[PDB]
Amino acid sequence: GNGRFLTLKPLPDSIIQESLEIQQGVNPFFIGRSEDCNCKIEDNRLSRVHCFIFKKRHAVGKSMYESPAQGLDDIWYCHTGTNVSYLNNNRMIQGTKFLLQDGDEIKIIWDKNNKFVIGFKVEINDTTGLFNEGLGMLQEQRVVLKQTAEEKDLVKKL
């Protein structure tokens, strides 16, 4: 690859059926109804910036002895459109940050009335000095974080 690391693959089961490629963690990645977002999701009720994937350096403590995880870069999926974000079994709200482990198929919008369900498959082919292969294996186990002024600023400029 010329610079691939994370492939975001939305599929046919979800209203979004395309494949995106996050180059060595190209952040932030904007996602929503308008293709303007680095990621494409055609969902009427879904906001243009409704969801965005951001990358940050994994916050770790002093490297006691010789151990990996010596501070690296992690990717955080930050939802934003009122439809609330959904990953595995963690429910989110309109503006939450969540870790994306490999094989992360998240539904940004799910409506039984119109079957308007979304789903993206996170597949990290390359791990560029990442805190982990990308399967998320830190102390926290799939926890939802809140978006602060820092995240809100990312969506300010698509």
Swiss-Prot record:
Controls S-phase checkpoint as well as G1 and G2 DNA damage checkpoints. Phosphorylates proteins on serine, threonine, and tyrosine. Prevents entry into anaphase and mitotic exit after DNA damage via regulation of the Polo kinase CDC5. Seems to be involved in the phosphorylation of RPH1. Belongs to the protein kinase superfamily. CAMK Ser/Thr protein kinase family. CHEK2 subfamily. The chain holds residues 573 to 730 of 821 of the full protein. Interacts (via domain FHA 1) with PTC2 (when phosphorylated); the interaction is direct and serves to regulate DNA damage checkpoint signaling. Interacts with PIN4. Present with 6900 molecules/cell in log phase SD medium. It comes from the Eukaryota. FHA domains are phosphothreonine recognition modules, FHA 1 strongly selects for Asp at position +3 relative to phosphothreonine, whereas FHA 2 selects for Ile in this position. This is Serine/threonine-protein kinase RAD53.
